[PDB]
């Protein structure tokens, strides 16, 4: 009965973690931020509408400059746009048209994409020949590739449907590190501001914090009732927010090792597809299956506002590095810039 | 007003726009089929007939009509994580082996392969993403089914069966039991073929069913339907 004995020891350890989490929870976040003023009402208008994609848009990522963004659609095309002038800087045809994620390198020299082909393709933008070439194809995942984020020009972290994350060295195309522990499909990831740690949310209603160098899971966070579609970090790096299929967003804290806040409203039952924060972290923006986006006071859990401009599911959204604008991309083949 | 480099960037953007519109038109004129079915149900035989990790894609052109066919059998993840990507396909080609009507599943004890294929067909046909999408159903291995139907009756799978143990009656019963799983009779049509291995009569059936689907789509576009 060695298996059963380790199951009892595991249950005892889970009870110990639960008791240690309840020990360090004297008050809630709502009890402390009950005296600060509300942010009011946030009215954001559609400044720009990026048109050109002919199928559903599955992902978008902003560049560090905050004037260039990359969008991916199922028509087989990564488009790199100029937000200020609505000009198409680049159009990259994909070998596989089943794309689910895209990333923009912090240097701006590369983009990445991936999807149902189980391959992360890295495309070089700054080429002497004047076109965009496939610089690398990273294969080794046995499930669909759901998210990818650049650490630098040579390292990339991908999440996949094979319940594993992976850190790749780009110039040799090899999995430098493999992150295992999730029992369901990892649907999203997010990198910290120092890129020492990253969090990943999976279809097992759990989010895991991973060290990038030592390749281990530091903390596990539960609380969601269903699949965690989206995850994003608070700007200090000491907290993250998860968007799930149970129509709630949740704010977890790495140092308190538990859930701090729940963002949910009885009128909204649709699941969250994408989450992001503002530059100060006071606003939390979440895209929903009800064709809209909701802006929540991240310290008071009130609905600060609604971004309602899409005719289909808001599949992805992002906030610029200076926080000047929010881009929402949706299944109605449009991206919209809100300010 | 714009500078010279801004004007040339706008001109490059409009060239990109025209290339996008041309690629969109050529993509729109193609036929996309999603291939589904149980493991070892004759899907490979169908792929070999049409042809002459990740998502397998098959390119073939019949009677001046181009067909892409997507096999997604290598995805071990749960279906609802990626099935919404195939919402706009022309048709779903569903392969069912008839010879599995008496063979128990090897993964799960006391569960039949035919019941599992009917539950998969019920999950796909009534999925919220495929309300208007049509299904081309291929019943594979009809000669092995005719050999087995002489010794093993259909009553081991369908206890409510009231017909004989002959080939054609049992085949018609299995066809009716697959076509009555369609809840949305009005919005979609189900086309059934017995995968005869003679004179390439399966590619012609796919062509005919896709032509019927394109006719119904044009009737919906013109407002008549």
């Amino acid at each position: 009965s060695e298996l059963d004995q380790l199951r009892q020891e595991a249950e005892q350890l889970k009870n110990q973690i639960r008791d240690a989490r309840k020990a360090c929870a004297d008050a809630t976040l709502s009890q402390i931020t009950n005296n600060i003023d509300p942010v009011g009402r946030i009215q954001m208008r559609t400044r720009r509408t990026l048109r050109g994609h002919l199928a559903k848009i599955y992902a978008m990522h902003w560049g560090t400059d905050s004037r260039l963004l990359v969008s991916a659609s199922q028509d087989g095309k990564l488009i790199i746009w100029d937000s200020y002038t609505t000009n198409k800087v680049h159009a990259i045809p994909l070998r596989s048209s089943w794309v689910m994620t895209c990333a923009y390198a912090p240097s701006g020299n590369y983009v990445a994409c991936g999807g149902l082909d189980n391959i992360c393709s890295i495309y070089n933008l700054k080429t002497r020949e004047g076109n965009v070439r496939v610089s690398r194809e990273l294969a080794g995942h046995t499930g669909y590739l759901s998210c990818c984020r650049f650490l630098d020009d040579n390292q990339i972290v991908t999440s996949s449907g094979d319940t594993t994350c992976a850190l790749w060295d780009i110039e040799t195309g090899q999995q430098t590190t493999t992150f295992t522990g999730h029992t369901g499909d990892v649907m999203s990831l997010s990198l910290a501001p120092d890129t020492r740690l990253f969090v990943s949310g999976a279809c097992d209603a759990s989010a895991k914090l991973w060290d990038v160098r030592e390749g281990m899971c530091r903390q596990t966070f539960t609380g969601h009732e269903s699949d965690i579609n989206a995850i994003c970090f608070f700007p200090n790096g000491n907290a993250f927010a998860t968007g799930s299929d149970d129509a709630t967003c949740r704010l977890f804290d790495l140092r308190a090792d538990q859930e701090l806040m729940t963002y949910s409203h009885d009128n909204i039952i649709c699941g969250i597809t994408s989450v992001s924060f503002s530059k100060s972290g006071r606003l939390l923006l979440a895209g929903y299956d009800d064709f809209n986006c909701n802006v929540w006071d991240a310290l008071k859990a009130d609905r600060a506002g609604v971004l309602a401009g899409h005719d289909n599911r808001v599949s992805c959204l992002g906030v610029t590095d200076d926080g000047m604008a929010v881009a929402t991309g949706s299944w109605d083949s449009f991206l919209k810039i809100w300010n | 007003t714009l500078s010279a480099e801004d004007k040339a960037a706008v001109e490059r953007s409009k060239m990109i726009d025209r290339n996008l519109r041309e690629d969109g038109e050529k993509a729109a004129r193609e036929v996309k089929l999603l291939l589904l079915g149980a493991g070892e149900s004759g899907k490979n035989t169908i792929v070999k007939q049409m042809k002459i990790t990740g998502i397998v894609e098959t390119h073939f052109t019949f009677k001046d009509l181009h067909f892409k066919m997507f096999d997604v059998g290598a995805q071990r993840s749960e279906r609802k994580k990626w099935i919404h990507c195939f919402e706009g396909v022309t048709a779903i080609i569903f392969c069912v082996a008839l010879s599995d009507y008496d063979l128990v599943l090897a993964e799960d004890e006391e569960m039949n392969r035919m019941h599992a294929s009917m539950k998969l067909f019920d999950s796909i046909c009534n999925n919220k993403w495929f309300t208007d999408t049509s299904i081309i159903l291929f019943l594979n291995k009809k000669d092995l089914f005719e050999e087995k139907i002489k010794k093993s009756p259909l009553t081991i799978c369908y206890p409510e069966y009231a017909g004989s143990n002959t080939y054609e009656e049992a085949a018609a019963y299995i066809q009716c039991q697959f076509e009555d799983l369609n809840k949305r009779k009005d919005t979609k049509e189900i086309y059934t073929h017995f995968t005869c291995s003679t004179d390439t009569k399966n590619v012609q059936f796919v062509f005919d069913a896709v032509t019927d689907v394109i006719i119904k789509n044009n009737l919906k576009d013109c407002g008549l339907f």
Partner: single-chain antibody, 235 residues
Framework: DVQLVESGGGLVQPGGSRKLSCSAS????????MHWVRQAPEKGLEWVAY????????YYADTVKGRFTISRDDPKNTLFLQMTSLRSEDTAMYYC??????????????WGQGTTLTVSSGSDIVMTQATSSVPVTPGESVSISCRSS???????????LYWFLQRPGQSPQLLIY???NLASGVPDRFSGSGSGTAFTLTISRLEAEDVGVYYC?????????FGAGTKLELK
């Protein structure tokens, strides 16, 4: 590698006709706009003509207007300049220059080797490079000044001035694009600092391959105009 080869030069009787060709290899030719730029032997560079990518936009200089015709054939990767009714002033070395235009791109980045054409016998921006020659020694910082008659700073925040270096016996090479941005393959010791109408190009720790003639070009408005060039020589 990227390569532009010109042909069609030689000696032409005055009033005649000739057709220059520029064959491109090693880059996506149909995504680059192309320029013809002439260089009379004693004088400096002078912009002649421009055809956009996709041939939707064509510009000429006033001197060559009505006489010259620029064209491109994209499947054969070839650029043509049909020159009719040639004059004595037309005698020059001709370069095809590639230039691509998007956000953050570097136009005028590659120049062809040039073909020699020998003919026997008002609102344009004026760029001024006041000092024609500067004597310098290696290892010493040096500043080259350009001055524009019109403000080159646009309302979008971009300042459109380019710095080129022509080594002796070679084609011009792009050094600085859009006032401050440095070009690919250019060493970091070059630096461009300008304030609307006055521009400076600084070469810290000068080396033996930095001698030659330095040209400033505006790209705010067509026609594109060059400076007279500032020459650096050793000793």
């Amino acid at each position: 590698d990227v390569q532009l080869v010109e042909s069609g030069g030689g000696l032409v009787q005055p009033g005649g006709s000739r057709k220059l060709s520029c064959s491109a290899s090693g880059f996506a030719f149909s995504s680059f706009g192309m320029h013809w730029v002439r260089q009379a032997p004693e004088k400096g560079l002078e912009w002649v003509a421009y055809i956009s990518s996709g041939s939707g936009t064509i510009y000429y200089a006033d001197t060559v207007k009505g006489r010259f015709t620029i064209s491109r054939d994209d499947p054969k990767n070839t650029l043509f300049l049909q020159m009719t009714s040639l004059r004595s002033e037309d005698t020059a070395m001709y370069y095809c220059v590639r230039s691509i235009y998007y956000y953050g791109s570097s136009p005028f980045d590659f120049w062809g080797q040039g073909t020699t054409l020998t003919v026997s016998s008002g609102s344009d921006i004026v760029m001024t490079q006041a000092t024609s020659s500067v004597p310098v020694t290696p290892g010493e910082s040096v500043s080259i000044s350009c001055r524009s008659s019109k403000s080159l700073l646009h309302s979008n925040g971009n300042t459109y001035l380019y710095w080129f270096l022509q080594r002796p016996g070679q084609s011009p090479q792009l050094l600085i694009y859009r006032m401050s941005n440095l070009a690919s393959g250019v060493p970091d010791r070059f630096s461009g600092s300008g304030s609307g109408t006055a521009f400076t190009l600084t070469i810290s720790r000068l080396e033996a391959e930095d001698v030659g003639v330095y040209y400033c070009m505006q790209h705010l408005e067509y026609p594109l105009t060059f400076g007279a060039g500032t020459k650096l020589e050793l000793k």
